[PDB]
């Protein structure tokens, strides 16, 4: 509880660098299980990378990563880490830690961490511009209206968008971001709402782009006079 397995944040690393991803165990006895490390490259299948016993510190890994992967666990802090050296563009993927139910190495994985996206690129990190998609220019007639937030020109993924700090969750549509010809990303989030509330309610989108440490809360007010 916090989660059960929880991981570190998304990172952009230059080709040739190294990345260290952690995985903190909470709410079970850390040294009684092994942890596996798995990655998923965009549009690909899951690929097993290695395993670490949290009791002995012993290691097993995929010979695909021979010479450039390391696995470490800090038994006091109940954290395991994977180090991946000599980063190539093709190491852009989501890295998961997942638990071995039995501590032997060869198992199904019953709990997964949430993943951390490592992007390997020489582009600089750029935080987003959030612009309101203001409801109407006096449209109304029917019952529902829609409003949203445009999150323009950031790098790398991901950006997290919440509405009225998490209390408004029904009818939110956060679209997949699109990579523009400049190399930067754009995404929209919208909510469809009873227009009868447009005058009583204040709608705020809460944008978080953790790679640039950007937090923005924007009020979507009607396209008003």
């Amino acid at each position: 509880q916090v989660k059960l397995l929880e991981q570190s944040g998304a990172e952009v690393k230059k080709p040739g660098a190294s990345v260290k991803v952690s995985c903190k165990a909470s709410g079970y006895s850390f040294t009684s299980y092994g942890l596996h490390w798995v990655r998923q490259a965009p549009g690909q299948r899951l690929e097993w990378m290695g395993w670490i016993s949290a009791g002995t510190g012993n290691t097993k890994y995929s010979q695909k990563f021979r010479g450039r992967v390391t696995f470490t666990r800090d038994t006091s802090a109940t954290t395991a880490y994977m180090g991946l050296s000599s980063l190539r563009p093709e190491d852009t993927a989501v890295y998961y830690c997942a638990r071995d139910p039995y501590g032997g190495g060869k198992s199904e994985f019953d709990y997964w961490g949430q993943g951390t996206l490592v992007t390997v690129s020489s582009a600089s990190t750029k935080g987003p511009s959030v612009f309101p998609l203001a409801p109407s220019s006096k449209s109304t007639s029917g019952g529902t209206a829609a409003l949203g937030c445009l999150v323009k020109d950031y790098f790398p993924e991901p950006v997290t968008v919440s509405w009225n700090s998490g209390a408004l969750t029904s009818g939110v549509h956060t679209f997949p971001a699109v990579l523009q010809s400049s190399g930067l990303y754009s995404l929209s989030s919208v909510v469809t709402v009873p227009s009868s509330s447009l005058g009583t309610q204040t709608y705020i989108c809460n944008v978080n782009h953790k790679p640039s440490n950007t937090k923005v809360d924007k009020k979507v007010e009607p396209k008003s006079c």
């Binding site: 299948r45 899951l46 199904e108 961490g113 949430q114 203001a134 006096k138 829609a146």
Partner: protein, 214 residues
Amino acid sequence: ELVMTQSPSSLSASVGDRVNIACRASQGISSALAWYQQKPGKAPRLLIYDASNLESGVPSRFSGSGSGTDFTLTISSLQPEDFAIYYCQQFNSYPLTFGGGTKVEIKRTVAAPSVFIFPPSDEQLKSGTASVVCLLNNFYPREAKVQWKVDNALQSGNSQESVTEQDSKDSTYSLSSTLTLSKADYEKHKVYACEVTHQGLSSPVTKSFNRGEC
């Protein structure tokens, strides 16, 4: 490595239908097969381990079978929340290996989109750019056509689209088209329109605005 091959890659089925996904091991693995469910954008979740054991809390409509080389996962009465990619993994040999995935999409009745259009904000035109967004909300099937027209049939080719995955509650998609032009290009034209074609509409729909608002 032991190769795991799933069949098919994709299926669409209605709710209540029984679906069966196959996975072959390139050689015998006894019962050391697990099945995962991954909703788009989330961590995979364990359904079945040892070819046939359901993990605690998984619905009783999931079942698995097979031994040796051929395994089947059956969903006996498909439900909307079952939209996902499904993977098999072996753990008989190292490297542990996954199959390629079977995406399961839900079939349902046509639903016509709600269409919305949004002008560029003020502070956006301050930075010298103007993004115009057209939203098609909650429709089925996923195929739809959005056409932009600026000063009536001067219909353009400088937009990008984004479509959400299937909703686990109602099985619809939503889509956004963003037209981007420079502040000078926008301040030149006055009628901006989004024209929509989809199966559930009886006529192409148009949402327009005049550059000027009020």
